[PDB]
Design a protein around this ligand. Sequence first.
Ligand code: 3QT
Ligand code: CL
Length: 292
Amino acid sequence: HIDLSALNPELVQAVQHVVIGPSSLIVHFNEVIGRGHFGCVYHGTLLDKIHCAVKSLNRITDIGEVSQFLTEGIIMKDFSHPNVLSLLGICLRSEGSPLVVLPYMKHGDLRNFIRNETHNPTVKDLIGFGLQVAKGMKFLASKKFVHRDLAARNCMLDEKFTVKVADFGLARDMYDKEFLPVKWMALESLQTQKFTTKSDVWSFGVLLWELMTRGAPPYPDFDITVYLLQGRRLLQPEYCPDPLYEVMLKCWHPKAEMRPSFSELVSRISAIFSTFIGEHYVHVNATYVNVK
Ligand SMILES: Cn1cc(-c2ccc3ncc(Cc4ccc5ncccc5c4)n3n2)cn1
Ligand SMILES: [Cl-]
């Protein structure tokens, strides 16, 4: 129960491009499509008929938090890019938690998509997914935004097989109940708890490994820092081309400043991608099946 009459009119006029009126939105509360600690995600219907994903944000319980929440909406909507999950808007209710309106992702998270045995990806498709992720991250890094939780489970896939870097802003949550994401963290971040775009480049190398293994868990077989400092990295996936594994190794350079930028990753990966024609099918590794 948020006292909405208290909201500042001048601020209301400023948040207008992010505000979705309650009469324009239908939330199917009986249809759970996502679950996180900060709220459930439901099938939604937005008018002027558009399919959407609606998150009920449990953190916002008072009018004093609404102004800041609406500003997080402005910042998040300005992160508009073909390869980044784009906020459609926010729905402020007089009864119940505020609603975060996101585009519906037909194929869900990228990790479950690649893991699904009814899908037949080629080396080109998987590299294409990595390239799209690199493109969304190039945009985010250009805005000085540090993801800190880049992984295949945190990227989404739409009806056109377009990858959207997600899990940020108002949509930030732990959507994988099995889970901090140490196996995706750079050596310096595990040690100093500090994150940068260079540490997102390390996570991206791990995401490339997830793509090539079709969603295998990284490091299957517990202190990751000590494991890495023995002089170890993830093995080359069976279907991973040599130049892409060389790119992975560059992403995991011990010196953060020596890691490629996301601009260099888009460039290098676009070249590798271009050499493929979609004739090499990527299969699941027998030693990775059911490992969780
Ligand atoms: C295993 N797993 C991962 C997620 C995930 C990851 C990142 C992210 N950023 C915003 C959202 C919420 C969302 C957005 C669109 C959806 N479309 C269709 C279906 C669910 C949707 C959920 N997520 N969800 C959910 N389950
Ligand atoms: Cl191919």
